[PDB]
From Swiss-Prot, chains A, B:
Effect upon mutating residue 48 to I: In strain: Gamma/P.1
Section of the entire sequence shown: 980 to 1027 of 1273
Originating organism: Severe acute respiratory syndrome coronavirus 2 (2019-nCoV)
Name assigned to this protein: Spike protein S2'
Function per UniProt: Subunit of the fusion protein that is processed upon entry into the host cell. Mediates fusion of the virion and cellular membranes by functioning as a class I viral fusion protein. Contains a viral fusion peptide that is unmasked after S2 cleavage. This cleavage can occur at the cell membrane by host TMPRSS2 or during endocytosis by host CSTL. In either case, this triggers an extensive and irreversible conformational change that leads to fusion of the viral envelope with the cellular cytoplasmic membrane, releasing viral genomic RNA into the host cell cytoplasm.
Length: 48, 48
């Protein structure tokens, strides 16, 4: 895209990709945080 | 939106609804993970 257009146009198309990929990454990180808390409970039980 | 807009103009209005509804569904699904992790600990105490 950014290859065919002009900074002014490339920008409007690049912003939708930025918006989608940011949301993807945030979903990944939230679901890792919820799963690490489940692994910590297991490791505390195994220590006990 | 599919009755008082032509297809090139209804895409822009349908996307605004899609984004909002996706956000709301994903908020629902995060808060259920966080509530289920709490019910799980209560059931683990009941089993003990």
């Amino acid at each position: 895209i950014l290859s065919r257009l002009d900074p002014p146009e490339a920008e409007v198309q690049i912003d939708r990709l930025i918006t989608g990929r940011l949301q993807s990454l945030q979903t990944y990180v939230t679901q890792q945080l919820i799963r690490a808390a489940e692994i910590r409970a297991s490791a505390n039980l195994a220590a006990t």
